[PDB]
Structure formats: C-alpha cells, structure tokens
Amino acid sequence: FRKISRDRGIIDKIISSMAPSIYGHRDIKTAVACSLFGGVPKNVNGKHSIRGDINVLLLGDPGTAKSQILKYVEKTAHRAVFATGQGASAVGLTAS
Amino acid sequence: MQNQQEENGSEISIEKMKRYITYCRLKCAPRLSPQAAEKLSSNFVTIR
Ligand SMILES: Nc1ncnc2c1ncn2[C@@H]1O[C@H](COP(=O)(O)OP(=O)(O)OP(O)(O)=S)[C@@H](O)[C@H]1O
Ligand SMILES: [Mg+2]
C-alpha cells in the first residue's frame, strides 16, 4: 500500500480502477471514488458536529449505466447496503 | 479557542448549561414589577 501510494499518479489510477465494465463516465468514477474513500467526520468541542462523508447523486437518462456502477460499489465497499424505492425484494429504508 | 474561552470563563460547557437551565427552570419564576407594566403597555399600544 505504501509503495503504491507514493506514486504521483496514484489517484488517476484509482479513477481508472473504478468500474472497469463502465466506459467514459470519468466524473462519475471520480465521485464514486470520493464517496468510497470519504472525508473525516468531526465534532468540535462536542457542541458542533460536521458530517464527513460524501453523498453523491447520479442523475441520468436511461441507459447510462448508473445501476451497474451501483453494483460495482456494492462489490467494492466494505459495508454496502442496496435499497430501491420502486422495488419490493430489498431491505427497506424505514426502521420498523 | 473555545477551550480557551471556557477556561477563561467567557463560555461555559454544554453540560454546565444543561444543569444551569434545569436549575433555573426548577427554582426561579419572576414577576413583572408594577413600574415595568406601564412601559410594556405603552410600547404594545404604539405598535398597534
Ligand atoms: N458507458 C457504458 N459502458 C458500459 N456499458 C454501458 C454504458 N452505458 C450503458 N451501458 C450498458 O447499458 C445497459 C444499461 O443498464 P442499466 O445500468 O440498468 O441502465 P440504467 O443506467 O440503470 O438506466 P435505467 O435502468 O433505464 S433508469 C447495461 O447493459 C450497461 O452495461
Ligand atoms: Mg437502473
């Protein structure tokens, strides 16, 4: 990890490593990498709390391979939970 | 800087505020002085 991190163009490689089955959506891959890696979430003096993880919205026309990117993030992430709004055979978003 | 202000006394901690709020709500309930009602009346009627 340390030997591969000290390369200057490591970040680009990570952007090249996101979703090899998806072609040409470089900004979406950059956003996916930022969401997977994430920032630090902080709580200054206890009183104020700043969120530290990136939320990404992939808005797109049909046939733009957003779902395949979501499955790639499911395969890649340590704890990835998939949910859907219209579908039924999935874990819900509502606590019960 | 917030820790410095808390040590100096210009700010208090959140738990100290919580216990102080509980103490003040439990102990104190003021009344308007008779001299303080006339100005309240005058200001309330000038606006209307
Ligand atoms: N840039 C791309 N690279 C590779 N495959 C792509 C690309 N764009 C579309 N596809 C393919 O086109 C199909 C679209 O599938 P989906 O990911 O389900 O589409 P979608 O983005 O979810 O849009 P919906 O489902 O109509 S809302 C898949 O077979 C993808 O592999
Ligand atoms: Mg889809």
Resolution (A): 3.2
A44 to B14: CB separation less than 8 angstroms, yes or no:
no
Q: How far is CA B30 from the centre of its chain?
A: 11
Does the distance separating the beta carbons of A44 and B2 come in below 8 Å? yes
Residues A41-48: contacts with CB under 8 Å, at least 24 apart: A44/B2, A45/B2, A45/B3, A46/B13, A46/B14, A47/B2, A47/B14
β-bridge mates for residue A49, sequence order:
A43
A92 in a known ligand binding site: no
CA-based end-to-end distance of chain A: 41
**Lookup result for tokens 């859907």:** A84
CB pairs under 8 A between A and B: 7
In whole angstroms, give the CA distance from residue B7 to residue B1. 10
Which residue, chain included where needed, has tokens 């104020």? Answer: A48
A83, A93 contact by CB (below 8 A): yes
Chain A residues inside the 8 Å CB shell of B3: 45
Q: A47 in contact with B at a CB cutoff of 8 Å?
A: yes
Contact (CB, 8 A) for B18 and B24: no
Would you say A41 and A53 are in contact if contact means Cβ atoms under 8 Å apart? yes
| Cα dihedral across residues A11, A77, A67, A84: positive or negative | negative
Alpha-carbon distance A70 to A31, whole Å? Answer: 12
Nearest CA in chain B to A46: B14
- Contact present, A42 and A95 (Cβ < 8 Å): no
CA distance A27 to B14: 42
- Distance between CA atoms of residues A87 and A70, nearest Å: 15
Nearest chain A alpha carbon to B2 = A45
Q: Which residues of A touch B14 (CB under 8 A)?
A: 46-47
